[PDB]
Amino acid sequence: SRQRKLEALIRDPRSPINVESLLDGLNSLVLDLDFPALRKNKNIDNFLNRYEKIVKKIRGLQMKAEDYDVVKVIGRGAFGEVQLVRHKASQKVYAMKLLSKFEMIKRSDSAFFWEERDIMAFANSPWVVQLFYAFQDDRYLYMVMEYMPGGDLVNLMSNYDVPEKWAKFYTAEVVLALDAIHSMGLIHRDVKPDNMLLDKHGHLKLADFGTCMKPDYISPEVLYGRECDWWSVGVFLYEMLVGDTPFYADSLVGTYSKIMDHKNSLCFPEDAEISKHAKNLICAFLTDREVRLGRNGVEEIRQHPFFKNDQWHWDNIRETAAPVVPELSSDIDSSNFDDIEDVETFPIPKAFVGNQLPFIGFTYYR
Amino acid sequence: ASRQRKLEALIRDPRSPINVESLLDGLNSLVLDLDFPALRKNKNIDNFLNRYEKIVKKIRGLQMKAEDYDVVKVIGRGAFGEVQLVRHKASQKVYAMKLLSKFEMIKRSDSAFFWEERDIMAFANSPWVVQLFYAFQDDRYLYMVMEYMPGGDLVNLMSNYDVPEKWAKFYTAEVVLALDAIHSMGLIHRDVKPDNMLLDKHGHLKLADFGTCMKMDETGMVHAVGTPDYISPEVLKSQGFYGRECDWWSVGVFLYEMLVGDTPFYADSLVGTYSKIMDHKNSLCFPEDAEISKHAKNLICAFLTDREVRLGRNGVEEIRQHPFFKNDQWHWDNIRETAAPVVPELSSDIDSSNFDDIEDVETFPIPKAFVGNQLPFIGFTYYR
Ligand SMILES: COc1cccc([C@@H](C)NC(=O)N2CCC(c3ccncc3)CC2)c1
Numbered sequence A: 001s002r003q004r005k006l007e008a009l010i011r012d013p014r015s016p017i018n019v020e021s022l023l024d025g026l027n028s029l030v031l032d033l034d035f036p037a038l039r040k041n042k043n044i045d046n047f048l049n050r051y052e053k054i055v056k057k058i059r060g061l062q063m064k065a066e067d068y069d070v071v072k073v074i075g076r077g078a079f080g081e082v083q084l085v086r087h088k089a090s091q092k093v094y095a096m097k098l099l100s101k102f103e104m105i106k107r108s109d110s111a112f113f114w115e116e117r118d119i120m121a122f123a124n125s126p127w128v129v130q131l132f133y134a135f136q137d138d139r140y141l142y143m144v145m146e147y148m149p150g151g152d153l154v155n156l157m158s159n160y161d162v163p164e165k166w167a168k169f170y171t172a173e174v175v176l177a178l179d180a181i182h183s184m185g186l187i188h189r190d191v192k193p194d195n196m197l198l199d200k201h202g203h204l205k206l207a208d209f210g211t212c213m214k215p216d217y218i219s220p221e222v223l224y225g226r227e228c229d230w231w232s233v234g235v236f237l238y239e240m241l242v243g244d245t246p247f248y249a250d251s252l253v254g255t256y257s258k259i260m261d262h263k264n265s266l267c268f269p270e271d272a273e274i275s276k277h278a279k280n281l282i283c284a285f286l287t288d289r290e291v292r293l294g295r296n297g298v299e300e301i302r303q304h305p306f307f308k309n310d311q312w313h314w315d316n317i318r319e320t321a322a323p324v325v326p327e328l329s330s331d332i333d334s335s336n337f338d339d340i341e342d343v344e345t346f347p348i349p350k351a352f353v354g355n356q357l358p359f360i361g362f363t364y365y366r
Numbered sequence B: 001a002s003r004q005r006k007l008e009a010l011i012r013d014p015r016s017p018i019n020v021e022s023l024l025d026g027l028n029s030l031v032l033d034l035d036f037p038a039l040r041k042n043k044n045i046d047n048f049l050n051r052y053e054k055i056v057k058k059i060r061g062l063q064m065k066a067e068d069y070d071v072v073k074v075i076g077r078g079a080f081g082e083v084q085l086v087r088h089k090a091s092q093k094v095y096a097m098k099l100l101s102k103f104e105m106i107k108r109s110d111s112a113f114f115w116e117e118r119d120i121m122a123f124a125n126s127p128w129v130v131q132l133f134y135a136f137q138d139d140r141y142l143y144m145v146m147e148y149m150p151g152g153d154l155v156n157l158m159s160n161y162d163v164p165e166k167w168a169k170f171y172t173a174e175v176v177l178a179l180d181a182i183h184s185m186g187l188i189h190r191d192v193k194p195d196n197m198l199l200d201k202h203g204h205l206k207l208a209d210f211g212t213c214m215k216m217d218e219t220g221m222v223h224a225v226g227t228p229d230y231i232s233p234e235v236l237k238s239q240g241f242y243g244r245e246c247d248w249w250s251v252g253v254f255l256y257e258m259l260v261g262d263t264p265f266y267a268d269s270l271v272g273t274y275s276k277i278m279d280h281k282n283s284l285c286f287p288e289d290a291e292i293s294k295h296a297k298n299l300i301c302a303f304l305t306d307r308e309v310r311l312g313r314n315g316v317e318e319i320r321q322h323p324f325f326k327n328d329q330w331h332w333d334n335i336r337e338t339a340a341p342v343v344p345e346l347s348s349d350i351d352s353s354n355f356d357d358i359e360d361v362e363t364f365p366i367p368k369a370f371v372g373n374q375l376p377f378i379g380f381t382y383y384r
């Protein structure tokens, strides 16, 4: 009557009280209590003695980091690292992103991962890196994703002088990816080549959504709407064609000052060639917000003359042949990823603290 | 799925402590023990609360709660609460609902008894046990919704009838089988007595109030109990390690009260009663005015010995073949499906005439730090 409606809420995996969330709620509770200090309270000690045994079983059964073998580390970021991994049981290969709980609490920002998870879990988009499994332990959050063995576009740009044909393609794929993120009612903000990866067939998918909300690449307005992503597309196209970013400076303060002054501070080096159409398009993205391209939807971008080739159409671009198909030795060839160089947890508390509380609901099995 | 079948098994089993009801208790319990403006000074908490705030207020609306029922009359009062005759507002059906103050249970640190009580009533599938339909909770109380038993207790029966031996053969036999079922479940009642013996719509026995039931250890033993008259001597010396036979003592005492009229160790003081129970070898004689067969005398004496040679040590079967129980009225396999001695005649679906009327509350302090008052009540909630 009501109890149908209730059982609906428990079965919906978008709901914050799905079964995974409720078990997080239990494991989180136990972890924030099981310290010999807090077991001085009888209420706690009783409760813990009951659930002690069952929770230790649950942990065995739930997905955990010991289910995977780490092959190589392939990424490092603010709050953790990205690992190439093999699921021991299934033998399949994934990319797994880790996030230190200690660090996220300590340094202010510990909400970003919700949208990141949801985007990757639920986009059904071939422009988004799909999330398969999210889970957690005492120390870390984990996100198991489809590995993208073609690497980022920094790694592409460093290894190729990039012709205009290639840039038409990679740009077009970006404008499509963003339109999808926009269709989901999100602004990326931090659009850049490090957040642009290449699949087994050298086609684009986006990853790292830490910034999605409901320096060189940043827009003036940021220093407020979706148009700021489209700025960053202009900057990208420029870096591909020219070689440097269009507001490069020695200092960061220099870069900022240049971005503000963009009306004056943008000229195109005469030693690099670039078409009129391509010049025009970059300038159309690098205006003030009020008359920037992509305010009035995606379609005005799509019909811009620059994008005319006799190679692909907008509806079929991702199903055409990519510029650079990677050649890969095995299911673990991380040749398009540079190697990586090289931990403090919470204090044992005296009273109750609730460190695990902002991570209840994270766990997701697809 | 190798493991994740096994996991989803544990969540679907309603005997398991992490069924869906338990996990939601775990959530509601958490929120209640945190949502105080004092503890929201911790940011971790306040974030978490602001997320779940909205969904939890929805959940409460949908879950079973006390406002789903209308209270008709109070029909029982006991250590940690009361028993209410109630009507489910929606379905219109009538139940008996037993309440337990959370404050009181914590304060007077008996707060485990309800687990066996709930489990017994939920999961006996016995027609000797009062069935539990729904258990739920609020900030303040536990609730247990049971089949109402409009025939009342056997105190109320014994007070309104001189009880013949034919009737006592019946009511005793029904007790014998009821206890054997509780014994089959690996439990000792301890506090067996007429107040804990109720009568259905057809005047047949069911047991209720299991606050004293404790689970047997590997041998069949266990380590206050009960009202004094019905207690056994061995229970009084652990109270300075005892088995199932102590229930069977209380059966002897019951049979005596039915046939004689008074309890066999009555006294003015309680101390008097205790002293008599210890001295049972001497202090038990039968009033010469009292109408009672040799068989019935013999059987009472067989229950009221020292533990070591008491009847029902060596299973139920030796009791069942005792000659006393011979009649040409019922058999052991069909007793509960025969006509009861006293079928109640009831005016309405709410006739509590077989229940005496009753006479006519402090909650927790708002805490400064985290306290966890709701923690020992996680898992209670049960929808049948
Ligand atoms: C703040 O904490 C962080 C920790 C690690 C990484 C990051 C940021 C800097 N980058 C990502 O999150 N990325 C890019 C690589 C993606 C990838 C790489 C290989 N294969 C598949 C995906 C995974 C998402 C931040």
Ligand SMILES: COc1cccc([C@@H](C)NC(=O)N2CCC(c3ccncc3)CC2)c1
Residues within 6 Å of the ligand: B075, B076, B077, B078, B079, B080, B081, B082, B083, B096, B098, B099, B100, B130, B146, B147, B148, B149, B150, B195, B196, B198, B208, B209, B210, B211
């Ligand atoms: C320690 O706290 C307590 C709180 C309340 C009650 C009690 C004890 C005294 N009695 C029960 O528990 N009973 C007897 C009546 C039963 C019944 C009455 C009508 N219809 C159906 C069942 C329900 C269980 C103790």
